[PDB]
Amino acid sequence: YNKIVSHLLVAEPEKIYAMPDPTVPDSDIKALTTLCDLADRELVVIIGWAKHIPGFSTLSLADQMSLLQSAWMEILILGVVYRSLSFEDELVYADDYIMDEDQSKLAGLLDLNNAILQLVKKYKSMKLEKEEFVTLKAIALANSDSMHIEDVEAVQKLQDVLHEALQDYEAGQHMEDPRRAGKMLMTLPLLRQTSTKAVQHFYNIKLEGKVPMHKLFLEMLEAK
Amino acid sequence: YNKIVSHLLVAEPEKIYAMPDPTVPDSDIKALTTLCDLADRELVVIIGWAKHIPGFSTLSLADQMSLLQSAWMEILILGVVYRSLSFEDELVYADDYIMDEDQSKLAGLLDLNNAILQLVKKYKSMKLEKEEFVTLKAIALANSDSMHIEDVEAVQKLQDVLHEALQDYEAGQHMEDPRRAGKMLMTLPLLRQTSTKAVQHFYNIKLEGKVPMHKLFLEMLEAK
């Protein structure tokens, strides 16, 4: 089928471990530290992945940064959503960090994780494929609505290249549902809503000053 | 062309006036009172409009209410966006209530209105048509992601009926851009983001207790 889709598949990064500190007693502070630490190392891996997206690295450095600073949380959330598709009421942040409802309550994340679980429920019934996940991830990046884009036309062309790939993939692979591509695009609003709430939540955590955060994660929180 | 699109066009409600009280001195409280008063009367008109959407009134009353309680602010915002397309850096809440940048600052709405203006900018370059506006309004309602839907399959069928109409309209009317339907769907995330921020903002205003609000507007704020 589609080459952009095959290319995004081979560019998909390897999963990384959360590695919660086994010597630290369980608390909300430990869980939030673990999660922000994981997100920080995933953000490095995300920056490297985006350079494989056709056309992304030919944008100016400021434009590459604007897109990432708008989309980082959507990309992170789509990741845990996809890793969670075969589970039931659990969120697979990492193979060694799977959160159930009780752990979400203790971390103060019950409402945010419930919204992530709603994204999971929708993608399960739609039988979301890996091919579709990596394409939506790239589209989320290109369609992130940064207020600060220099070359608007070039960003809009990146959006069109990825949308075409999604259309081409669905036309060849899902002839039983000629509207599957649009259904996939219609999942993006709930992803944007959940990411908007998540960024504000962790920005509040940053202001309370009880959870240490690393440099890149703080940079992504401050850009917003 | 498409009958659903023609039907939504004739079902479009008449514009109403904001009628700011000419005896009241200008303040943030007056502007916010005017805006919430307008929104309250528009919400009544929106409930009546939705009964014209094919299939909507055959949903149970609880399901009709769930969709409206999720989408009300998106529908309101899409309205002012569309009324503003021929203007420059101004938001046409009503023919007698057009807000420029200075008035937004004084009302404490500078950041929210700037995001609404970003929606306007995108739809201007895309040359959004009235046919496309009324269809996206209906799709926003059907795709509002309520957590409380009883008949999930029936809501999903409503989504498919409206998506089909958008696809059919664009295929016949915009043969020069075979991906215009998807481009239109890809504007929905920024609309959902802006509405999420707007609801939280006016919920905070409700808690401060200095701006009187009417019954329906309060009901829509409390459901969230």
Ligand SMILES: CC(c1ccc(O)cc1)c1ccc(O)cc1
């Ligand atoms: C930012 C963090 C997060 C945790 C719980 C939320 O409800 C929202 C966000 C996170 C970390 C690593 C990921 O792979 C994905 C998300």
Ligand SMILES: CC(c1ccc(O)cc1)c1ccc(O)cc1
């Ligand atoms: C809720 C109110 C509003 C004002 C300013 C905002 O930035 C966001 C929302 C509003 C009232 C009437 C409308 O037709 C549309 C919106």
